[PDB]
Design a protein around this ligand. Structure first.
Ligand SMILES: [Zn+2]
Ligand SMILES: [Zn+2]
Lengths: 332, 332
């Protein structure tokens, strides 16, 4: 109920992409009757969205009802398209990034921009990042938990991290691209269970991969309370200690030592989980996030943090806003 | 430091299974240098185990040292063999359950048996359960978190649950046959992360699949504090409520209602995680588990429990023994 770090938005419309680029599997927007719209596989449909998902005035109203001062805006993670030709992803990223920037120009004290980047091609990613920060004025970028077969430990990605750290650019890591078929096709598991596992893998990849060691000024936030990590850190840490041969031939420091070194969003739904999240990650490093406007997110942003009779007013305020300005390097 | 619900043992020797069944993929134990054996799965040595993994005299000695009174013994999960022809698995289970039954009979005050079954052939698995419970006197069985393409919701598995329920045969679910390659082939991810995820999926499959509603008296314990479940139950519970088309099509109750309906082992490593586990699952439903003799387990069994200064004594003795006794259906 002050700043929402995790909020997704799309342009009203965009070019046909199977044409602009050639090949398929790209995602499009079809509005049938104003108020509602549909997201489409190329093949068959995969999400029914509302007016809030593209219309910034609709967004501000809802934000006024809900007490939300600013939303950090990123794209819908399905847009990442790390799987496609690189130069084509650079294109889409420019389109999405300029629309995002355009939305911030209309309401520069209600919105900020988290850019997107062609991560599968590190040096283009670097350039599109100098641009996001220095021309567009974005305070960070949103990226995926893994990039194809690369995980966030990859050496191929170190140039990007170096750049993030150079240009003071924050990173919001969003899980995406779980397994959808076979055992995971029922009960909404890729979302309910697959997303948290992707985030947990991402935190590990980075800690054990050397990233936080080789870039101590990097600002990283993970989605969904960082998945399973706050709860399974004990196991990850003890395992690092038992098999230094499987786990440390890349960075020798125990994962427990980077508690304090990264942020997570507070989208965990339960008070007991929120409490644990703050005891493990820290009161300074947890950030309110809503996943607005999707049904799986928090419906009353901050309602859970406000109900925590054990936090004091200072702590509730780091959670609703204070920690988020730190992470993005902004001022009130 | 009283009862250990989670512990594995192998026979010292077993026949060459390729020879016995006509095709490979099985594991063998080789004894080459002293106090040590190699497990090979067609090709490679994939694990080196010490004598405490097969020799009950040795286990008794370490139990004497650690203050453990009973270990509930089960085979190593790699032996589940759910992939083989249904007759051969059945043959192997009889060998392993007999070995198990022999160990137990030599020390029926220090061990209880958890048998193994040909899960991929539900009829064959009901007979072996009959035999484990009636002939062999085991209080329960150990099974995997999934059976090939089936998950714990599968209908074909239902006659098995009906058997266990009739027979007062407890179920101990252990994760296995998680992806080992690709992105999961570094930093021991399949064990640090993949295993907790497999168990979160199983708990989801059993709840949303109706299993606890169909069989209100089935008792089930899950390995490793139930994986990620206790921290991510909010997200599972909320998403269930948000998308009943995907989630409530088999069982109309929110997952939260099934808290208290199943057990988990206490193998979570940190006090904060333990405290959450019993806040969420309940003080009467967490069992001391150790994963002896593998190095990912608790090295000083009970020590995480005994260190917890918030728990009264009654609570500690529940987590150390009472809960295990209720879950197994036995007496002090
Ligand atoms: Zn999101
Ligand atoms: Zn185990």
């Amino acid at each position: 109920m002050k700043i929402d770090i995790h909020s997704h938005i799309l342009p009203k419309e965009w070019p046909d992409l199977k044409k602009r680029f050639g090949y398929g599997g790209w995602v499009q927007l079809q509005h049938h009757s104003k108020g509602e719209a549909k997201l489409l596989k190329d093949g068959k449909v995969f999400r029914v969205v509302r007016e809030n998902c593209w219309d910034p005035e609709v967004r501000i109203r809802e934000m006024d009802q809900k007490g939300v001062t600013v939303q950090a805006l990123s794209t819908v993670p399905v847009m990442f398209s790390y799987w496609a030709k690189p130069e084509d992803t650079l294109n889409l990223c420019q389109l999405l990034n300029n629309d995002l920037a355009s939305t911030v120009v209309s309401y520069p004290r209600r919105f900020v921009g988290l850019g997107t980047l062609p991560m599968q091609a590190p040096e283009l990613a670097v350039k599109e990042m100098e641009r996001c920060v220095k021309e567009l004025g974005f305070p960070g970028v949103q990226i995926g938990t893994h990039v194809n077969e690369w995980d966030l430990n990859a050496q191929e990605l170190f140039p990007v991290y170096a750049a993030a750290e150079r240009l003071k650019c924050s990173l919001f890591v969003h899980p995406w691209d779980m397994q959808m078929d076979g055992r995971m096709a029922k009960y909404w598991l890729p979302w309910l269970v697959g997303m948290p596992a992707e985030t947990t893998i991402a935190i590990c990849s980075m800690i054990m991969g050397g990233v936080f060691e080789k870039f101590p000024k990097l600002k990283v936030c993970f989605a969904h309370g960082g998945g399973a990590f706050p709860f399974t850190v004990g196991r990850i840490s003890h395992g690092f200690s038992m098999r230094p041969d499987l786990c440390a031939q890349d960075n020798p420091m125990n994962p427990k030592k980077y508690l304090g070194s990264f942020y997570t969003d507070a989208l965990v739904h339960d008070p007991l989980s929120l409490k644990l999240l703050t005891d493990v990650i820290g009161k300074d490093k947890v950030i309110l996030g809503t996943d607005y406007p999707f049904p799986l997110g928090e419906l009353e942003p901050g309602k859970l943090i406000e109900s925590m009779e054990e936090f004091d007013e200072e702590t509730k305020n780091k959670l609703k806003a204070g920690n988020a300005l730190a992470f993005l390097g902004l001022e009130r």
